[PDB]
Amino acid sequence: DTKEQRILRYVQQNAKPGDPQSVLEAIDTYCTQKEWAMNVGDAKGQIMDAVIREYSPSLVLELGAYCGYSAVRMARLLQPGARLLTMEMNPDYAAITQQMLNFAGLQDKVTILNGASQDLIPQLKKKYDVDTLDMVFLDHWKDRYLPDTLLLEKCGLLRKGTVLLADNVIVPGTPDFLAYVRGSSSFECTHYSSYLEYMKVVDGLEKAIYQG
């Protein structure tokens, strides 16, 4: 028995099936009252809701799924026919995320790509019929934010107005990505201050909007 499948079980025992909001709240209390996990969490969760409502993206790419919390968070707010793609390298995690999405009712909105983003991003246009992404959520290993951003730009996945939204920009930190995105005239940035999940340490999301 694994921390993640401990969470999956809590959800299946406590959330109302087919109800995304309920699933989220089961995850948040489980992680607030018993075991800490690295889900984006509710406080930054609300920021993400707001940004997605604003842009209403047709096509979203998530880097790093884990137990499915942020994928459920985002897919619940997508319009009919909009699509989330989520990359997860750990198959135990990609298996839980599927079960979590399934429970929430969101499996028709969300495609799990099992693998490592560096390998999967170049396969995106060919194997998944992607022209450009409207939004990208970055929440995988922190040393991967910049290289995957440069890789998305390289494979032609970014479009004038594509929104990159980055978790953990302060804690644990992604200094090279922040420096690159703020300094670059090809990305318009706004910082949205908040607090780490389940603990009030100051983290934040960076939104970085691709300029071409």
Ligand X SMILES: O=c1cc(-c2ccccc2)c2ccc(O)c(O)c2o1
* Closer residue to ligand SAM (CB): 107 or 188: 107
Q: Is 167 annotated as a binding residue?
A: yes
Residue 57 interacts with which of ligand SAM, ligand X, Mg ion, none, CB < 5 to 8 Å by class: none
CA 196 to centroid of chain Cα atoms: 15
Q: How far is the CB of 36 from ligand X (least distance, A)?
A: 8
For position 42 contacting Mg ion by CB under 5 A, the verdict is: no
Establish whether 167 is a catalytic residue: yes
Residues 136-195 that bind ligand X (CB under 6 A): 139, 141-142, 167-168, 172
How many C-beta atoms surround the C-beta of residue 49 within 10 A? 15
For position 144 contacting ligand SAM by CB under 6 A, the verdict is: yes
Strands, DSSP E only, in the chain?
59-63, 83-88, 110-114, 135-138, 163-166, 187-195, 202-210
* Closer residue to ligand SAM (CB): 125 or 188: 125
For position 87 contacting ligand SAM by CB under 6 A, the verdict is: yes
Q: Can you tell me the distance from the alpha carbon of 154 to that of 18, in angstroms, rounded to the nearest whole number?
A: 38
Residue 142 interacts with which of ligand X, Mg ion, ligand SAM, none, CB < 5 to 8 Å by class: ligand X
Binding residue for ligand X (CB under 6 A) from 10, 22, 38, 58?
38
* Count of positions on this chain that bind ligand X (CB under 6 A): 9
202 three-state secondary structure: strand
Q: Can you tell me the distance from the alpha carbon of 61 to that of 131, in angstroms, rounded to the nearest whole number?
A: 12
Residue 4 corresponds to which tokens in the numbers above? Answer: 């993640």
Residue 149 corresponds to which tokens in the numbers above? Answer: 């951003």
For position 139 contacting ligand SAM by CB under 6 A, the verdict is: yes
- In the sheet where 110-114 sits, what is the strand order? 110-114, 83-88, 59-63, 135-138, 163-166, 202-210, 187-195
Extract the annotated binding site. Answer: 40, 62, 70, 88-89, 115-118, 139, 142, 167-168, 197
The binding site for ligand X (CB under 6 A) comprises 38, 40, 139, 141-142, 167-168, 172, 197
